[PDB]
């Protein structure tokens, strides 16, 4: 689901 | 400067002398500060005086005009024995000033009256009278159409005075060559500009002297060429044969006299004079081509012209014959139009005589004991002949001469070098004989595959080359495919014949690709043992390429096992190299697999199982493992990326099974080693799969995952300058997104940092990286355009709006700054394109942005200049105006 | 050209103004233009100015002197300079009282000549010496000295960087002389506004050139006079503006504040004194002066922005600056406030760069005060009747406010301001024009407010659909826009979809609200695409009844587009019956028009139905795998005869045939991989109709079929059969007299199609009978002067020749290379000859970069062959050029390492013909 | 610009 | 030009 796309974007 | 000691006479000293050149070039009486005392630097001085006094024409006052004349007149008299070539620099410098009708306004009569009767005025008076009408309307100085209007018609009036001066020069010590070399150059100029304009040279000394000097055996190469070039200049001055009364007749009879002098120069082997004559003869024919073709054998169309070029084209030194070539091409191009069958017919007897001579010139020495080198000086001459033979045979009939050529092979025991030259000529005109009905093509083909191995290497090599051309006849007559391939296998197995045999097999594979399912196994066995044959790189690549293209045309049932048998040879080598612990180089095997995957593209219908998928899934682990093994080596990783690119393309629409495994491994390797080829491969994945809605999210995760390591590498000290490759390939990838799915990128958190880095990368002085960044900016902004209201444009209009609100000003500001302060003019059309696109989305918003940019710009430049530039850009109605505006503006900083 | 008689010139001048045949003015303007370009202009204009007979002749003559001096100072011998100078100085003295329009032309002519003439060094001091003390010369001396700094950088004028920088440093040296003259011009006649204007225009001109010493000008009471005039109420519009422009000129010059600081303090204090003068001009409604002050105040703030931000309230960073602009932004005339806008953008942008919270703290107070004043400016009059208009003198103003408000609210926090805006609707008893203004501000920032802060957006969104139908039409209009902007909130909170669609349906039924409701429904369709499957039947009823609503064209097209984009997202089970019910309402109308034979078609034109079907087919693009029946194929195959028969009925009308070709494109595109069942029927009918009626849109549609299907080996043959079959009728039409010139669109679309073949299937075209005829026509068409047909022909030539370059030897290039070779062996020379010819004789410079591309491609295929071809072209070229220039151009072209070097070479060569 | 821009065509794409 | 050319690629096609 698309929300997880934001999660892996965040780190460093 | 005194420290110029090394310049004329290890770079470590001369690097010092060179630095002070570029300091001084731009700068400005100031150059003539040498010679405070005159003692034997003066080269660099005089060389500098030419270029600077040339620029000074359009810089200096009209105060101290005759100063230039009298300083130059003085210097040239005092520097008479330095060099003949410095005289030319100074003469030109004087003449382009002296021509300009201010100063003392001294028309032709003035130089004549002031200098003529002084015996040592003539060396230099001639030099300046030579160059002056030559550099009217002419180069380095700007054309000067302003001044041109009056002058040529005065030089037409005064030419008689200049001719009479030149007649004074031959009586006054026309005894030795240097004076006549000047006289001929001078006369050639006043000829060239036409300005004689009258019938009178029948009553003149100079034209007879010119030809006498050319007939002499005791004349120098210098003088012979200066006279030859004068005669050519005089021929070019025949603008049209009849535009004034024909001094043409005098020049025409004059050149025809030189045949005796020609024949004697060839008997003496005086080659530089033989070449000078062949030029004069050719330029006579060029100058009167129209008269020859439209009035053959009548007046100045006399065919003794061609007859002289036929004796030249027979000269054994090939450098002589190839002078006449451009005339033969030009004669051919005229015949190819007019269609008067007598204006073909007469000339066909000459063209056949030329074609016989050219064919004789294509014969190797009977001495020879190898194949022809195609990079020999004879080899490269052969090509030029070959290409001319093609064109003139096309006027005659390619059937007629291919017929007569084959007749020569099968009569009267032709020696090997005649046989080889014939097969060479035939290979040029094969691919130009009609295949709809000529069974004689089958004769030569059949008669060549039945040629024995015992004939000299050259005859076999060239008949192999001819067999390649004849691949077009093989396709129509596939009973020959089997014999033909047989003849080529046999040649393929001999090192010098191997590459030529490979070329011809590749020709057969390409042309007959549809009809070779029965022969694929024969190709496959060669492809298996590719390295045993000792081929060139191109030859081995061509042979694989051919087998793969034929493989692509098999029945879908055979491909999987045929493809794996092609690849296995290379896959095994790679597997062995993984078990080889470092040092190995998998390059040659990766690059063979790449050729195979590039060309194995079968036609498969939908729902049908694509036959490569199974092979590529079995191979993928060995390539994946090879990539991870060599992950630190940029070159081997690019050789992997290119192999894996074609491996996924090889699988057609079934790419989906491999795309995520590839994208994963790309991210993993790039995360540790930021090789820009992964950004470029990502750009290929985006370009070719970005229009598929299933691939768009995975590709955006790939961009986000390639960006984090990329940015961290550019953040570093000198990261832009050190990684221009990375900048180029980053903006390539971002631009492919903008082309194939802009809305996907524009909704993403990643477009804002990509645009921030684009703005930073505008400062990088690298032409390809710059080109890539500016394309991204142009294409990103263009997604705010909507010249079709019926498009589903609304969401992208919205998201470009949001993006440009917060970074459009920072963009226009940095674009203007980088034009003014960072980067050379090569950027300006690209920045102009970006600015133009911003105006074509939203012109009044752009106006504000450019305004606030000009205010933020860092007294020399005036507020009025800023506001005039803003006006110029915001009201341009084409992109090219923005380019001009920005350029002119850029010069102010 | 012969010199005209002077009475011919006089009647021509009299015809330019006073011929009652206004075509007489065409022939007068033209011929006096030819006179102005000719040699004879010098003497004729001098004689007309000597004769001083009338204004018409003197204007023309002075304008001519100007035009000649600036363009043609080179065609005068150096001996004539002081003659022309003293001639001009005679004329301007003589004509000083005749008309100021003439004096302007003479003042320009004298300045232009003075700038180009280096002999007359020190000219400023000489003009002052000659005229300073005669009061009747001061009007024209000022006019000359004013225009002289303005023409310094005039690119009309042919002056190098060297000479221009020498001019400017001289002008700088004599600038104190010029200022001293301006003081003399106010001791004498300083009570007359006409002289004060000329003085302030002159001072302003010399400020703009950057040459005045700011320290000398600080010691100068001429700036005190300049401010005193701006304080006095009784000055004219023209003087007040001249003084205003002069103060701005003085501010413009001092951007390097720290090097100009004594004068910066005087201009800074001086401008702040004008507050009393400003308040008085507002009180008496002196709008000219109010605007002039707002400009001065804004230019002060622009000039001191860095001092303001870096040292807030300190020295020349004093925030009385912003307070003045806050006074201005409250003025009721909206024309006053929008002067200050670009400064507010620039301030807001600087603050966004320097993230320093004690800068942000201070200025947040200023930005929010402006935000309240700008928001009040958005309020309509309470006696406004209808909806707000958009392309309207206040409609346009509101957009600009909305944009500045949007941009600056981003610095404050979009959600914090959106919260406070909604509070303004909730609190007190707000009237309608406040409520609509707030909804308008809210609509502008809504899509920049954060859907993470869901509760406030949800309250707003709910309350705004619950408001009743009795509310003023402008509130409803603006609320519908806000509902359409908050569509992202509906997608995040689908319980609102049904209420929102209900709210919008009511507006859609009410003619002034209808088009705004439609645009919002289109946003809801677009944005809430996943949730729309339940609402499709509502959109289908709208689509059925589309003409009943009285919508704009863009509203009706947006609505169909939306219905088709959500139809494309239904299950594949459902699409066929849904797509057919969407189309049938258009298909029925076409079936009727096929039945209605007894009329000429006009006023029963199938256009609107074909257009609507095209929008539907364009956007109905379902995601269908090859294992799934494509649900459009069924529908398009039933509709196909209706369109096929419409195209045959209207075969003679170019426009209706285009509308049919556009519909039939999108019909085939819609059906995905099932295009296989439709290409042969289409291509057949295209060839059949084109064979009788050579409309170029069939060539264009053929080009699209080649672009989109030429990559498939199965279609390559059928498409080549089509190109061959379209060529026969095409060529026959171009063979006719002036066929190129008369059918440039046929030329354009023919080479478009040939170029798509080169792009997608080059070997298919290159083995064909037809490639050679297409090149032959391309070579002929290089002569056609039509920018687009030219662009299309040169692209074909470029992309055709390029297929022989083959730099990657690993590609399947060998058969291409050979076939281009055979084509170029037989036409390459003829191409290079015509390319050179058409640059030199036929066509304007717009072609040169495109011809340079073609020539560059020929060199990149085979350079030594190109060399010969260009050589034999230069020989074949018909006293104006010499063999050496031919040879220099050949050399300059053939040695090039980039395409653009050919462009320059060919251009310079082209100037010789 | 022309009739050709209303086709979502190669004529449009960049 | 560069490594990028040895790919049958958008770089080659445009
Ligand atoms: N030299 C790096 C400047 C830069 C580019 N992109 C950025 C994003 C955030 C901060 C700095 C930068």
Residue numbers in the entry:
A (entry chain E): 153 to 164
B (entry chain B): 12 to 20, 23 to 41, 45 to 56, 59 to 600, 605 to 880, 888 to 922
C (entry chain A): 3 to 880, 888 to 922
D (entry chain C), E (entry chain D): 158 to 171
Original authors' sentences:
We next aimed to gain insight into the structural basis for TNPO3 recognition of RSY-NLS and obtained crystals of TNPO3 C511A bound to CIRBPRSY that diffracted X-rays to 2.94 Å resolution. TNPO3 forms a dimer in the asymmetric unit of the crystal structure, as previously observed, and CIRBPRSY was bound to each monomer. For the CIRBPRSY peptide, only 14 residues (amino acids 158–171) from the full CIRBP fragment (amino acids 138–172) could be modeled unambiguously. These residues form two short helices, each containing a single turn (residues 159–163 and 166–170). Inspection of the TNPO3-CIRBPRSY crystal structure revealed that the binding site of CIRBPRSY on TNPO3 is located between HEAT repeats 14 and 17 and involves more than 15 amino-acids. TNPO3-CIRBP complex formation is driven by several electrostatic interactions via the charged side chains of CIRBP R161 and TNPO3 D747/D751 as well as CIRBP D165 and TNPO3 R667/R671. Unlike the canonical ligands pSRSF1 and pCPSF6, which lacks a helix at the binding site, CIRBPRSY forms two short helices between S159-S163 and S166-H170, respectively. To accommodate the loop connecting these helices, the TNPO3 ligand-binding cavity opened up which is visible by a movement of TNPO3 helices 14 and 15.
Transportin 3 (TNPO3) is a nuclear import receptor known for its broad substrate specificity, often recognizing arginine-serine (SR/RS) repeat-rich nuclear localization signals (NLS) in SRSF proteins. TNPO3 consists of 20 pairs of tandemly repeated alpha helices known as HEAT repeats, named after the proteins in which they were initially discovered. It adopts a C-shaped structure enabling it to interact with the nuclear pore complex (NPC) on its outer surface and with cargos as well as RanGTP on its inner surface. One such example is the cold-inducible RNA-binding protein (CIRBP), which contains a non-classical RSY-NLS.
